[PDB]
Amino acid sequence: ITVKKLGSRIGAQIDGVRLGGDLDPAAVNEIRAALLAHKVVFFRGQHQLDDAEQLAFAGLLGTPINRWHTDVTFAANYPAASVLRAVSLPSYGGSTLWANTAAAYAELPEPLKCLTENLWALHTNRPDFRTEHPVVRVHPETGERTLLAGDFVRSFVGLDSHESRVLFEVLQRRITMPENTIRWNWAPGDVAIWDNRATQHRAIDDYDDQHRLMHRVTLMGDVPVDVYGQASRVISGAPMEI
Amino acid sequence: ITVKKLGSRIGAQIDGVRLGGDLDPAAVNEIRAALLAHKVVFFRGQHQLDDAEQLAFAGLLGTPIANRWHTDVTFAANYPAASVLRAVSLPSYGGSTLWANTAAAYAELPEPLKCLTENLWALHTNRPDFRTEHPVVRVHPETGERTLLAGDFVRSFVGLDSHESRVLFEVLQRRITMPENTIRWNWAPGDVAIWDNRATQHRAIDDYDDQHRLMHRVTLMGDVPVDVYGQASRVISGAP
Amino acid sequence: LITVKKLGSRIGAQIDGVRLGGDLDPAAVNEIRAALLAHKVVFFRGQHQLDDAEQLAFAGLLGTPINRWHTDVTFAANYPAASVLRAVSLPSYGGSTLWANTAAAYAELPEPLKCLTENLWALHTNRRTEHPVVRVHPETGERTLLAGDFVRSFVGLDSHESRVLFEVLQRRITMPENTIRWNWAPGDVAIWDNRATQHRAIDDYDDQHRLMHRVTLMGDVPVDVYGQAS
Amino acid sequence: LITVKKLGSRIGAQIDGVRLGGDLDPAAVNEIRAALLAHKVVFFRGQHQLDDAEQLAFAGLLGTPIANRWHTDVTFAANYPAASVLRAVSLPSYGGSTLWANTAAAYAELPEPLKCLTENLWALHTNFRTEHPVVRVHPETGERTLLAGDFVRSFVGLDSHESRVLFEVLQRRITMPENTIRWNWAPGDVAIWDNRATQHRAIDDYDDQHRLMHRVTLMGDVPVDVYGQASRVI
């Protein structure tokens, strides 16, 4: 299997792989290794994939279930990863952004490390979920610390409205720096997988309003732990199921 | 020539044309049309290009003269109108480039911000020592469109203090650099880019791990900007 | 007749020679409205004669009677024009109040900011009305900035834009040069134009008890410089 | 006979029952030192005697002798003033108040994430360049106090835009009115402030009126952060 780096901090393309549910366990393994190391990986020309064949291949990586955000973070046990397939694409626009929340963290100045390591945020959905997540989580498989924030954040705990907004923007500025991100131009047969535990993503609304359809499969993740081993606190449950 | 839209607010790719200083006027005019409407145009497969070839093709467009979002050399009063840029040797990964539409940014402003910007002036400096008060809104000499003039050379706004100047600057830079208003170009060999420096900002991305990278650029002479009441930029230090 | 002393270059005055009450002189009552309009906040010392009925009585000769930086209940379309406030029992330390001059704040704005605010509208809710961020003063014709802590947003702007711009404005409005901080003493009475000021209490007397009696006059609806109304 | 009255709950006191000069008892000049430490800025009314030689004489009793933006005195220096003495000479007919803010109370009240940030944050001070901690430990009281103010040009390891934003977050907490005192200057007024645990700010609301004050600024040791580290010069 070939994995080519697309950027120094994030992104990688993978070929020599016909995505589907009957993959050799060692191919599935090299893909995961790449996914964890590159945060978002891309597959071209998987015109063969359909909804069910895609659902089947995601079953191999884990347990199936605009603006900058990590997926569903208003819930305590939000997704670990997602498999997204292009199905109907607009003649122009419709490209997608991802940022590396692990690298964002590692690159912090130590003062900002100390602050984030001790900062918690309340994540809300504008069904009513409210959750208190650490701003730094320890990645369950890599041990890498990653910044947890994004659009679902409503406030930092213990801080006033003004300071919350301002610090949020400071961190979002560092996460979404172009050097730390990748913009993907979708072509038919394109497939994207990303580690929702070490990324944020953002749809770009620049196909005016043509027709756009992508299919998505989401894998189960677990509750974030901060650097001291404390878990996210649910304020308005409940967890995600299945 | 055939022109393909890359995004709803900025960018187009043009096929059906070989680049040289011997192109048909009817083709040069379709390209200037295309550049003016799309703000940045991309040509692929232009392998034949070469320093003097490229320089000769920029000549049909005007008179020949990075990691921070900016408009080219705005610390000068009559800064460049346009640039033609060619990749020579590219890194193995990374090394893309961003452009944003400062014309579309102005048009989308909320009414109160239109007022503010229409009456605001910035001091652009080269941090030789250039200093130039520009309007924050310039009226484009060919399209008549209003466009935002800011970017990384803006040292401050006229009649505003540092704290408010830095805060308003951000508010403006945020709207200009909205992903819906930008294009990010993955460079390939044979790639040429042309942008209207009078209606855009650009930003190089440093993510090829300081591999080696070479691009050739020809810049074209531009006019002094005029605000929406017909007043022109003022020099404080330096010459055209 | 009476006396008026400037407490600062942009705001506040102290008036001497007057015994506040409902039997007060027409000329007196007139030099006071004059002083209030001109100086935005006015103070009288030594008024130990006042109870609530006489404070009111006097509020009637001026008009019609009824924390964080703010203008009084702006989330209301027709919010109060002016207040009459006296100390009842003060703490032993702290307890001072701030006023800021919104009219001078406008005047001092750079043209770019003038043009912005003359064209800006804000959403004022509680704890819901849209006002001009500049209102023409129904008596002085002075232009004044109408913001303050009741603002939830600016019409047409997004959340990051609203906050950032509100702070820019509030920072100019509450600039020390443009405010007055009053140290209360018994017998003290403050009168201010709610249509040309913001005010803020200071919570710096710990748990001591602090008690004030206030009468509020009726204010009209703000109109912008285009004759537009909330 | 010497009485100290609190002026606000977080900052300020007036000291009555004292005439200033070089002749005060050790115990008196010590009553003054302790009030200064605990209240951060202290005021003396009706001190019509003092002159430019009486002030100096008194200053030496507390130490070793030597504007409308919130700041801490001369922080572009590695070893700035520990305290200053200020007397009114000629005052405008209106305005001319002064503001002080308590940088010890401000630190103490930071939420813990901010404490963490500030205990580890360092600032560059330029009028000359110097590197101070954002939290300094006070030589006498032990108190941790915020070291910021207008002479700060940037934070170490943060970019221009980041520095600015955080600087304002800090300043906003330091200059909160509950944490400040605004002194209305009267002739014969003497103010004394601890420059190691305060910021101060002149208010410029008296138009074109000559405001004449006379200051005696005492000597101060170099700052250390919560790890015993010290300020650097650049």
Numbering used by the authors:
A (entry chain A): 4 to 68, 94 to 154, 177 to 292
B (entry chain B): 4 to 68, 93 to 154, 177 to 289
C (entry chain D): 3 to 68, 94 to 154, 180 to 282
D (entry chain C): 3 to 68, 93 to 153, 179 to 285
Task: Provide the authors' original text about this structure.
By contrast, type II sulfatases are non-heme iron-dependent dioxygenase that oxidize the C–H bond alpha to the sulfate ester using α-ketoglutarate (αKG) and oxygen as substrates. The resulting hemiacetal sulfate ester collapses, liberating inorganic sulfate and an alkyl aldehyde, as well as water, carbon dioxide, and succinic acid byproducts. Here we characterized the single putative type II sulfatase from Mtb, Rv3406, which is the most highly conserved sulfatase among mycobacterial species. Rv3406 shares 54% sequence identity and 66% similarity with P. putida AtsK, including both the iron binding motif (His99, Asp101, His165) and the arginine residue (Arg267), suggesting it possesses similar enzymatic activity.
To provide additional support for a role for Rv3406 as a type II alkyl sulfatase, we obtained a crystal structure of the apo protein (2.5 Å). Attempts to obtain diffraction-quality complexes via soaking and co-crystallization with alkyl sulfate substrates, iron, or cofactors proved unsuccessful. The apo crystal structure showed a near-perfect backbone alignment with the apo form of P. putida AtsK’s crystal structure. Both structures contain the “jelly roll” arrangement of antiparallel beta strands present in other known non-heme iron and αKG-dependent dioxygenases. Rv3406 has two disordered loops adjacent to the active site that did not appear in the structure. The homologous loops in AtsK are also unstructured even in the co-crystals with substrate bound. The active sites of AtsK and Rv3406 contain the H-X-D/E-Xn-H triad that comprises the iron binding site and are highly superimposable, including binding sites for 2-EHS and αKG. This allowed us to model co-substrates and alkyl sulfates into the active site of Rv3406 based on their empirically determined orientations in the AtsK structure. Due to the high degree of structural conservation between the active sites of Rv3406 and AtsK, we speculate that they operate via the same catalytic mechanism. In Rv3406, the polar head group of the conserved Asn residue was oriented towards the solvent, creating a hydrophobic surface in the active site that might favor binding of a nonpolar alkyl sulfate substrate.
